[PDB]
Amino acid sequence: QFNPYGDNGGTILGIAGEDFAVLAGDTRNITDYSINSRYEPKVFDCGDNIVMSANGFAADGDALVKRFKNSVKWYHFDHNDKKLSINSAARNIQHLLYGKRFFPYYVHTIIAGLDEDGKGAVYSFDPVGSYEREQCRAGGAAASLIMPFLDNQVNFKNQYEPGTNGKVKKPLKYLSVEEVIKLVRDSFTSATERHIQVGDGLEILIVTKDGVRKEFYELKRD
Amino acid sequence: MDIILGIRVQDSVILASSKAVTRGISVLKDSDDKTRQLSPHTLMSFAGEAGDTVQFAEYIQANIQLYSIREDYELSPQAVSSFVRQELAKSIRSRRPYQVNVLIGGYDKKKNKPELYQIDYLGTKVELPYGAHGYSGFYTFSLLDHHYRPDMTTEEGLDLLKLCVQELEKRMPMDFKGVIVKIVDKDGIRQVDDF
Amino acid sequence: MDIILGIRVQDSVILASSKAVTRGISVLKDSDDKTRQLSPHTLMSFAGEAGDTVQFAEYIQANIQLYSIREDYELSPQAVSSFVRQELAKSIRSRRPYQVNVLIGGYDKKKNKPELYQIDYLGTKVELPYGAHGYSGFYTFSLLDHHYRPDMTTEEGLDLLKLCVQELEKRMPMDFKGVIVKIVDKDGIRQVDDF
């Protein structure tokens, strides 16, 4: 019987700071136990200071990204070149996803950019368009390995103030871009160690009010 | 849903319908009225698939009320029952059939007779002295075969109904949270408030 | 079968067990005692697959009574519970396993402490302040999490149990026909006759 879905592996990760946000993903693409490519990007600049990744079944991921990019194009055409805010992108993507509720896109979607007050924002979606804004999200194959690390290191979960008798939590605070890139790089090397579908390369898109910058790092190729 | 009964006595039709609404391992409600007034002298009780029951009942109610307004006249219980049967008979061969069973109790004012119709989801119609849908019938039919008489009063009918509810509360596996009882006669439709 | 609960208070263990025995759409019985005395200070309630429950309970009872006669001594509740667990743990990999869940309530006379053990058909044993098997736990555990205190009297325990039975009679789909309550303490095992 023909199975219209496949699984291309990889994993993605979004972190939001005070005046920036990052969207990272490995560059490995796989099916079963074979590597298809060691460098096939899956995080994209979509215009209007929005970056997007839709990880899982790549064909669905590409279709969705294409549709959203196109949605941004027509938003300009129809509303006098107005900037598509991250909250508006998120809601639009919900409708893109839920429109295929009964034949879903098999992807975990994350977008990152800046909210309307210039603060860093990360939005994540389930495959049929449930969504939520967060400081923090890992998605894809190694999500279960990385996400609890992020709860601990980004949101300081289960961490208390020493000598306060486990009564005063470690206080929340925004991270510098330098600190965030450190957590991203460590998250991915750890994920690469223990997950076979993660490796080869890491591409990070950083989003500030001056635009979108990229950084790339080698990952273990086994 | 589950328990719906009906008895026709000399001068009225009595409908008894369980109050419980259960989903999973939770009784969500214990005061549910499983009935719709179709016209001032016609009442319909219903049981079956969740959602389907009320959707069907209200849809029939809307159609009968429309007819009443259009002709300034009340359709006879026999006529209403035939309309309802046809709707269910169509439904059973649809893409998704209504899984609803009904009892229609009405007082025909032209004949001055009470009438009870039992119709299942397939559109199987029968006029009866007493009726039941679901597992209820497995206790009540035999009980009523024994105790029922054609010329009973409304009060005798209610006592006969107490017997049925008692037996069901003794031998039925489920807690159906009692019944709401309604009487249909020459003066219309009313509800007994302590049962 | 279905409902079995147990609460351990300061000086006793209280077991409450439903009285109904249902097969198909008929409640065959409303006074069933779902319990066996294993020794004078140890009581076991049980629920599960028809036939298996009593066969298992009586078999354990026979073994514990044999031990008592042989050694002229009463096995501690902890020891009895471990014996029972092993029997169920063997059973789960047999050709046909016992599908029986039990609560073992006992008063340890060496320690002067009441003890409640919850054991499922897989041989999963846990000692608890309060316990339940089947769907009952889905209402009572949270209720008991709220209202239970470790130092309650036997009377406080019974009131706490009234709360549990009330909630189950409100929200459970089935009519389980009330509970038989039994108290295990330093003076042995007795039955409360009006619950």
Add this chain to the structure above:
Amino acid sequence: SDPSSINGGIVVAMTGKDCVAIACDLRLGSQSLGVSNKFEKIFHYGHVFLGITGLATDVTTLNEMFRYKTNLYKLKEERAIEPETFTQLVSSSLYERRFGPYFVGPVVAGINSKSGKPFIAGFDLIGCIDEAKDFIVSGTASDQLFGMCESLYEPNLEPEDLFETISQALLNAADRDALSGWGAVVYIIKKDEVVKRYLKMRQD
């Protein structure tokens, strides 16, 4: 219907400088229903520690079995069983039930009392030994534990530092698993003192 995730729970073990740590959560449930908050998954036979995750009836059974076997070992050998040896005994005993196994994920930790070496190991349900320098993980939140351990861990931690690290790995992994948590215990094991600490964690 998957026996390894009916009851839930986790075990993690780590090595440090002249020490080992082994920790577990305290949950025992029946699918969605939490039943017990006191169900410890770590046992010891002399100075050798065994943690067992998986089906709770088998966890209990295997503890009772290895107590039995190590007691006879001690009587005949006139010494306490060492971790390297116990690890082998665990492996033999599980593989003996190859085609009708115990649905468990055992973890061994301890210090060899002759050589002073810290030792940890993990097993599959069928007896396969996984010996490791660093950490072993087990249970329904094993993915999470692998993630936490692989990022948090560093070699040669002092006992009080190792305690923080293993605790944080357990806690944050448990909190991303619906079937693990409800309390936690951490054993810090040095050549001849063993401290046992109960952690404060979220109770949902």
Add this chain to the structure above:
Amino acid sequence: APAX
């Protein structure tokens, strides 16, 4: 699809 995740649930609530």
Add this chain to the structure above:
Amino acid sequence: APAX
């Protein structure tokens, strides 16, 4: 059970 793990593989190689």
Add this chain to the structure above:
Amino acid sequence: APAX
């Protein structure tokens, strides 16, 4: 059915 008739095959060839």
Add this chain to the structure above:
Amino acid sequence: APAX
């Protein structure tokens, strides 16, 4: 499995 290997066949010939």
Add this chain to the structure above:
Amino acid sequence: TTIVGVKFNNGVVIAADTRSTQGPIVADKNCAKLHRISPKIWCAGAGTAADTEAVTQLIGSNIELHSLYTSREPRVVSALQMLKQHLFKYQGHIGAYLIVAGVDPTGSHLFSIHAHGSTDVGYYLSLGSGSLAAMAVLESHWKQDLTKEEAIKLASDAIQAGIWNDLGSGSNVDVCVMEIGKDAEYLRNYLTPNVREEKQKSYKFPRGTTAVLKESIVNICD
């Protein structure tokens, strides 16, 4: 797994990667897939990890007893026959896929055994998920009359193809060389081309970070 065996001039060499998987997760980064059946008969195993270890020890045990009983050094064909007849009896349910090699009074030998119990003879062999990557290399570079050093290079090259190109294989290369008239040399972690890079940050916590409820000294003594 990836495993290989390569014959040469005066003996035989086997090699294996060191990755263990439980689904997509790497269970063990450095397990030993090379097993000693007798001092000069070694075994590489792929498939169900416990099965390859257990079946290798059992036959190793019986070979030792047999060697003692006969006052002779064990032969590879005895290990071969015992392994195959055992595996055949179990109709494939014991999932051991083995490359058996060694030297004995008869000479040097190389065999493979599949789990249903069929055996093969060859100058070069590969088994496991990475066997096609390895076999591509073996078919490309193998020749008649290899020296010991050529055979080692060829073997570890074949394992490397598996490490890089197969998601079921990774980490290190183990080798064992069995030369006629000499002791077998077991080269554990012969190659280590997948060393984890230095982490960006130390996650060592402030002491007292973790909230404790109780302490107590455990009694390990008598």
Add this chain to the structure above:
Amino acid sequence: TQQPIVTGTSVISMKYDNGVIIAADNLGSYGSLLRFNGVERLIPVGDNTVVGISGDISDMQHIERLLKDLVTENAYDNPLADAEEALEPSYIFEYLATVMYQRRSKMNPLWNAIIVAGVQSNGDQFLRYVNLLGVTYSSPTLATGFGAHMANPLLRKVVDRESDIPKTTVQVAEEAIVNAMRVLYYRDARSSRNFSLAIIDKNTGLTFKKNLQVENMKWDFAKDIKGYGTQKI
């Protein structure tokens, strides 16, 4: 909902310093029956693109017709059809990728794996893959079927990353491709000895070689193999 009947096995390919090479054997199998032997599975489009196809041959022939119709359509009202508005490899690929994904989305796939190899008008090498699911990817080496398992590891020994492409000559790369084809003939039970190979160079253009054969095979050691273990003669 389909099942492939007449099928073609691996298509293998790689980038080198000046262009791309792609190869595929001339077999059309029918299950285990090696039914047809003169099957061309590399289809050139213009003088700058070759499309290599594996999988169902009836669907391959359909795709041939689409490509040949695409060339026709591009020439319509196009005075620069053989110049600035000639079909690029990237156009041909995206068209195919679009079709493949639409057909999978209608639950009626074209049962193929496709590699589009060519050189863009600016001289850049194009190598991209698409299959019945509409999955697409690019790599310095690409292969389908057994090729993915056996050719890629060999071809990646030559070009393991982007930077290795300038360092790889057409002689080196053709050697690797031709060697990979031999290995596949040793090891793939649905391969043939005969194959075609095409080079698309940014200077020399398209060279299409038909009727190649696998040669220099090692079989001699077979004579020394007696029995399956203990047998001697």
Add this chain to the structure above:
Amino acid sequence: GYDRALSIFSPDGHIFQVEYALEAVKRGTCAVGVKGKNCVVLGCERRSTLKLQDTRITPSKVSKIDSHVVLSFSGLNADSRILIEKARVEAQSHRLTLEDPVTVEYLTRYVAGVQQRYTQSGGVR
């Protein structure tokens, strides 16, 4: 389907088919509505060039749309039946979905909407 644009604009900005429909109303029997402090009364003339009429069965001029709303009219009698039926159906549908009978304004707005629709749809007068 028959498509012709029958209701169209004339050079002076009038829609003659709508205006001629008004002429048909003008020819109709008189109807009057007066609302008191606490009631509304509907009066209707019946043209008296007709004896041998059977008044039991002859369509009355005031129609109940629901049990709390009535509608009367002047103009083409056959046309009015169509509007009354549509109005009656909408009244029941409103009860079904809103669980409340129609307001008089709502029901009026609906009937009005139907009438307007017939002034810019093809093939209908």
Add this chain to the structure above:
Amino acid sequence: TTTLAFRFQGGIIVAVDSRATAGNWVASQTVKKVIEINPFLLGTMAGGAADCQFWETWLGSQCRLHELREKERISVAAASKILSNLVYQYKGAGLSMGTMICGYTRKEGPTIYYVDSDGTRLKGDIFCVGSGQTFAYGVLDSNYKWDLSVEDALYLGKRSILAAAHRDAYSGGSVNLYHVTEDGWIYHGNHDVGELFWKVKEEEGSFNNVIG
């Protein structure tokens, strides 16, 4: 999920948890399971995260159009029936929703409707909905009185979600609290179970099953 809503002397209490799960994987601890439809209308979410979120924000748009067209706020009955008639059209397609539509209008008073994806629509004073509904019911039912003070009602609702969050593996994160009156809804905060459990254990002396 665990969600509840109950009517009482002082209006309506609405309380929900914030956990989303995919199997045993805890997907989020910060889901907003109450949707604020208008200043007098609330909807609760349980079942499919997307199904609930999508159709309940769609419901808000439909309620907005009602008030533009009718120059009047929509009745709870009519708002709930839009949602129930919508999901009934999809019956069998596999939508998964258990929702409560909670609000005040002058014509109705404070009103709660339970609406689920089988097409069941029920008016009532007390409902609990979700995988943890039974746990919430146990506490809620055994302390419920019509005459609870606003203060007690808020706590009971909060405490009932806590009960379910503790015992039900698929409920947790935090409690979100609302109070609905004749003047509209009032938010009464987000309460992490992380701290709330220990606070309640200490102050109330309950949860003795737990190692203190």
Add this chain to the structure above:
Amino acid sequence: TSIMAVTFKDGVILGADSRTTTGAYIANRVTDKLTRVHDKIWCCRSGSAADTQAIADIVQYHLELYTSQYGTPSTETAASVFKELCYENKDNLTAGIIVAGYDDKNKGEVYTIPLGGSVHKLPYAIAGSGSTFIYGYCDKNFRENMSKEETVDFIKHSLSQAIKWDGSSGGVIRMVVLTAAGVERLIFYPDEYEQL
């Protein structure tokens, strides 16, 4: 597989391809499917590699024990021992075996044992997946009392065709010659047989 055995003037010749299959993957391209169960009684193996090896090993053992007690067994006897194994274990075995041997009384003999464990004595026999494609050819070209060189050619040409059409056959063509003169192993490589 493709296998066959052919009787001729001086005895019998066995022939086979050398391909072992694991799906569409060739697990072994130089397999030896012609197997000795006694000095001048050999068999061709097809079907499951594990089953046919296990069977041949048992048969070799029986005939070794037969030899010790009663001297050289007949080819018929060897075929009977194969049958007994194949027939009695027909539910668990996938083994298509041709038995061929040389007596001095009986000259060359061929017994084929298909899946069910029936026995069939024939002048020549073909079997294995590839045999389907050469029923036509072999029936048209076989004669009795061929010479050694004619028989080698018949087998070479037949298996060449079976290998050409069957994807589950390939590699080298192996042959084993069985006469009064002893036992001769032959091998023919692709470059020779392919272009026949």
Add this chain to the structure above:
Amino acid sequence: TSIMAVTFKDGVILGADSRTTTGAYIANRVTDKLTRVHDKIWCCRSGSAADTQAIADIVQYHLELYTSQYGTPSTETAASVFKELCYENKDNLTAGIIVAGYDDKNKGEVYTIPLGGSVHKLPYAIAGSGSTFIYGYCDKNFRENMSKEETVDFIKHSLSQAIKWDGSSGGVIRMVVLTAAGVERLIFYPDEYEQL
């Protein structure tokens, strides 16, 4: 079925057995599997009798209409119309068809259309269940530019063997000869072809 078509010096010959099967029962022992779609374009039918008849009837209709508007269609064109039907309806059809025709420009041509609806132009083609048994034979015996008598013999001998081994083939051997000279029907009975 067993069917084949062979090009030669003067044109092309089609051949077929005459067996129709309804299980192991022979529903028709004198079937005509060689079918006219135009004066000198014919086809051999295999697979479902109903499918192949329905297909051939439609093709005949298309080519009749083609003829009326544009004159005589090429054999390639006829094969294209078969393909279009077989390919587009591949899910619902069990039709293995060989198309053969004679142009005066192109001489004899053979196109085979297997199950999936692919097209393959060949010097000769064989198909049907019985064809498996004669791949060896036919590959060994076919040459290009045979004479009419050689081609009749090749087909007769080939189908004789296919019929001998295939239980789903039998009856008479029918042939249709296609040259510039016109159209010739041949038939050969069992007593002749069996003992070849």
